[PDB]
Design a protein around this ligand. Structure first.
Ligand code: CWJ
Ligand code: CWJ
Ligand code: CWJ
Ligand code: CWJ
Ligand code: CWJ
Ligand code: CWJ
Lengths: 158, 158, 157, 157, 158, 157
């Protein structure tokens, strides 16, 4: 049983995130989608909201477990008995900061291997931040979000 | 009549912005310099201030129209009957975020073509943020701003 | 208000990415010159011109021409005031900025405009397509039908 | 749950950076094929395979094989569903993203996975090592002992 | 007597900073480690705290002088009679912003030459921000900080 | 307190960007060696040295020398403790970081220092200048007078 963790702020989870976690489940026996509380980022949705949205959005994937956490990433991964940490790679600025995080996590937990997946071309130019920005100005983001997430984002901004 | 829109926060408009809008007017019949309210960015100048500064700074360009807006970019462009969106390209981090915005705008308004211009070497290393930072510490920024803007920035910080 | 734009490249061979860019250019400017450089291409200049002409024949305001001068020199003699460049990724951007500053030095009245291809074509180039096809990979999706036929014939011999 | 992964490259010659990557891969996947491309290398394909075999003999689930097809074609015929790529810096990232989208077009069932080397090996490549050694620089730290011996012999003649 | 200035926010000073300033002292007769007040960055440590930490962390380097400042960088460098400004280069996003700052400083003080040093591989993936983030979640950062700084960071977060 | 710095490159030919960098170096360090690598240049090593000498003769503390060893080996034998590199754009930065870590491995006592050229020269290189000039573009602004004369003569034949 190979266990992988897919951590992030997921504020909110997008179709880009869904693509990454789906490809993770095709590679590893069990995938933990781990939502960081991230108070420093002032998330639009609470951790409880983000967990519920991701749970509904991944219910069709049998080997996904959605969990919220505030611990240090490396500690949470060890405590989940994960040996693989999944991250999606979008742009150069993401890549460089991801290298930093990966080298720090390797110092904290050497047996946790960071692996990067590339999203579909369809999602390679979207982010949670960009979708929220469009929605803040009432633009149509139905294409970029799971149905349940779109409703919740519309409701939140209403 | 080809109509182009040059959107941005313009907080405040710099000589780099003046260079871009000038080259836009040499290419398209009518250029709308569109100032986004951008409350999330906490602009130093109000939208009304930024519009007045840009109006004075572009008065010598006959086919520039300065307008403020809070709508979604794509909607404002459609409502202005613009089919070209101008953006200046400065650095790598700008380029990647501009690609995101352009692909999102293309989803929202497919007939709005995003085109990028390269500023003069003189302005390729300045930004509104950098000029404000120098001025906050009382450094001489006369070279980087239109006369009216420099006065207003000096007055604002006084 | 009648702008002449030039879209230069080697187009060895022209891809759907090039077709995307030139199509966007024709919706923006009155006349677009698709300019094919004479200089070790897989296809000859005459082949590259003929392929590009057939692939753009449906665009009424495209003119396909070959050139061997410095691009700026040809643009000047063609009375172009707009230079079309497609931007795919960071790597192009950095090299295109260099070329844009050189071209502005050589011909100040030629404005470089950077267009963005569809996500569908943002990761391809003529060189990658040729390499994949040379090594028995499927590139049908990335090329006009006429180019695909010509590429298969070229690789068969 | 028994994943077959392929780690392709020219490995001319295999470095400690490659050893780092393939070692990480073997801790993640059941079987890893270290696939050496036939195509102007300093070492012949037979030399490169023998060097890589000796340098990975301690890894029980590594299989070193040569191939001359398109990488995706070989991966398909090997029933690999995971493609291992090492990421050193921004420059690789940009080119690897291109290749990853092409490989997904060619073989959708092959997932590209990017691994990160130790800081120790993040700035080296086979080409840089060869260039330094060719010009009388010390590269002992960057190579397996067997490769170091073979490189010295090659440069002596 | 060649005088160099190594400016930054140093919130807090890391082993990466120590590496850079050490290599600066091997190249120039006198190095001023200059700590910017940086109120816009909301530093975790006060300027007085950051100065004291850096002073203790560099006490073994005889030709380092630690000073705090709120002036414009170029003015402070001129007033220190420095003709070399040291900056460490970590990642692409740093590099581009450093080019901006260097070209602005060259406009403000042409005789102040900006020079960039590359940190050891050991520190090329750490930053003050990343260390603080790990420590906020109680992760072990002993490896990345001078002893006195680690204690102060532990105490601050306690 | 008497630092010896080396500024290595191919300088084929030396440009105003190189002159900018070496001038900045001489204002920082006591002695600067402009080191020209022997290795398919447009100008011979003897031409490149003579061109660089004339273009820097006004700088009293510059020494122009040719070398064929590994750059680090030559720097060691010259008792240089400072390595001068010019940084133009992101692309250089990424490759220079690689080289800097290799050079630190080869000669730990050689510190790499990166200088920034004027905005005027931030987009040029010897290769771009040669390519533009080869294709009948004006490069007078980017070169010392003596180099411009020599480049015209070289391209005439
Ligand atoms: C739970 O939230 C976080 C947020 C940022 C984080 N960075 C690292 C290294 C661990 C971590 C955990
Ligand atoms: C008027 O202000 C804005 C600010 C950011 C924006 N992003 C997009 C896609 C549209 C928009 C409008
Ligand atoms: C960016 O400007 C240029 C300069 C020279 C060029 N040659 C070709 C074939 C395309 C091109 C574009
Ligand atoms: C990223 O995918 C590829 C494609 C072709 C390839 N050839 C070799 C030798 C390695 C490789 C990797
Ligand atoms: C003392 O603090 C600062 C902070 C940012 C700064 N930028 C520039 C150009 C000078 C300066 C000084
Ligand atoms: C960055 O370090 C190096 C290494 C080898 C080098 N060769 C030449 C001609 C310049 C140079 C610089």
């Amino acid at each position: 049983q190979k266990r992988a963790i897919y951590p992030g702020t997921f504020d909110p989870i997008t179709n880009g995130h869904i693509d990454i976690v789906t490809r993770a489940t095709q590679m590893f026996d069990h995938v933990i989608l781990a939502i960081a509380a991230s108070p420093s980022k002032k998330p639009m949705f609470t951790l409880e909201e983000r967990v519920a949205l991701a749970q509904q959005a991944t219910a069709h994937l049998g080997n996904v477990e959605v969990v919220g956490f505030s611990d240090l990433m490396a500690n949470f991964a060890r405590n989940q008995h994960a040996t693989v940490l999944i991250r999606g790679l979008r742009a150069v600025a993401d890549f460089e900061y991801e290298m930093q995080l990966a080298h720090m996590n390797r110092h904290l937990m050497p047996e946790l291997e960071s692996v990067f997946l590339m999203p579909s071309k369809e999602w390679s130019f979207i982010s949670s931040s960009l979708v929220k920005e469009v929605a803040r100005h009432q633009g149509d983001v139905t294409h970029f979000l799971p149905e349940n997430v779109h409703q919740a984002l519309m409701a939140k901004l209403a």
